[PDB]
């Protein structure tokens, strides 16, 4: 039932968006998170931020000595999100007035 | 802190302000912090929270001050740049509504029922009279 | 169950509207025809 939330709430709720992937570490206690990016009013994209052997996190924008690494992490799209229920009172009044 | 044009008041104030904070210590619960304060990407959300400083439930309004971990010290500090009123702000519902959707589900069908019954009686009562008048008229025509 | 309250608020008025419109058309269409038949019948009576 996440579809009834705005993309902005989903984007500011990193525990929700850790539930968008399952991660298998190559070495014990290697960690990973998804960075979210708004794509439309109804969709987002996510890309992993993953620790290497040196304890540091790398993602699409990582550099060494200022040179982009361009490692090749994926971007995955999630879509279908709607606006939150601010409309309920005006709408059920409209329906009643219409019926009347 | 979020400016007043960025607040969706029904999301904050459909519940009373009475339980946004722990009564034992008057800090606001974590779920309301990102709803009231803007923070950068990758930020440690456990490092900042809001303290209640005055309120009134009959006006549904809450006044708060923010405290953040000092990067240099094992202690919390205020964030003085957080608003035009400094580390302190107030929030309010802008309009006076409540749980009125719950009786609306009782009231709407009742009015519809009353209006439907009245409509039925208003149409139904004359239709019976018309029939009788028509019959009487034909009967009289036949007699004549 | 219980997820459905918000769509029930959409769906109930729509069905009522559809049923009301149908009821209106079902009563309304013959009432116009009855009137015309009555008039025609009286007109014919007068002619006879």
UniProtKB/Swiss-Prot annotation, chain A:
Result of knocking out the encoding gene: Probably essential, it was not disrupted in a global transposon mutagenesis study.
Protein name: Mgp-operon protein 3
Portion of the full sequence shown: 854 to 953 of 1053
Disulfide bridges in this chain: none
Location(s) in or outside the cell: Cell membrane
Species per Swiss-Prot/TrEMBL record: Mycoplasma genitalium (strain ATCC 33530 / DSM 19775 / NCTC 10195 / G37) (Mycoplasmoides genitalium)
Swiss-Prot record, chain C:
Entry's transmembrane regions: 5-25
Compartment list: Cell membrane
Lineage: superkingdom: Bacteria
Residue ranges that the Swiss-Prot or TrEMBL entry lists as coiled coil: none
Protein task: The protein is the major adhesin mediating the attachment of this mycoplasma to the ciliated epithelium.
Protein family: Belongs to the adhesin P1 family.
The protein's name: Adhesin P1
Organism per entry: Mycoplasma genitalium (strain ATCC 33530 / DSM 19775 / NCTC 10195 / G37)
Gene: mgpA
């Amino acid at each position: 039932n996440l579809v009834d939330k705005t993309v902005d709430e989903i984007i500011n709720t990193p525990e929700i968006l850790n539930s968008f992937f399952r991660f298998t570490p190559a070495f014990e206690d290697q960690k990973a998170t998804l960075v979210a990016t708004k794509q439309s009013d109804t969709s987002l994209s996510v890309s992993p931020r993953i620790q290497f052997l040196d304890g540091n996190f790398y993602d699409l924008n990582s550099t060494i000595a200022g040179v982009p690494l361009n490692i090749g992490f994926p971007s995955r799209v999630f879509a279908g999100f709607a606006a939150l229920p601010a409309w309920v009172i005006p709408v059920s009044v409209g329906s009643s007035v219409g019926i009347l | 802190f979020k400016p007043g044009n960025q607040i969706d008041f029904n999301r904050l104030f459909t519940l009373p302000v009475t339980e946004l904070f722990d009564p034992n210590t008057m800090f606001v619960y974590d779920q309301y912090v990102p709803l009231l304060v803007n923070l950068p990407s990758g930020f440690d959300q456990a490092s900042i929270r809001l303290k209640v400083i005055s309120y009134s439930v009959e006006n549904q309004t809450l006044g708060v001050r923010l405290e953040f971990k000092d990067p240099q010290t094992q202690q919390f500090i205020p964030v003085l740049n957080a608003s035009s009123t400094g580390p302190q702000t107030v929030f309010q519902p802008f309009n006076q509504w409540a749980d009125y959707v719950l009786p609306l589900i009782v009231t709407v069908p009742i009015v519809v029922i009353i209006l439907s019954v009245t409509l039925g009686l208003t149409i139904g009562i004359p239709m019976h009279r018309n029939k009788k008048a028509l019959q009487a008229g034909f009967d009289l025509s036949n007699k004549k």
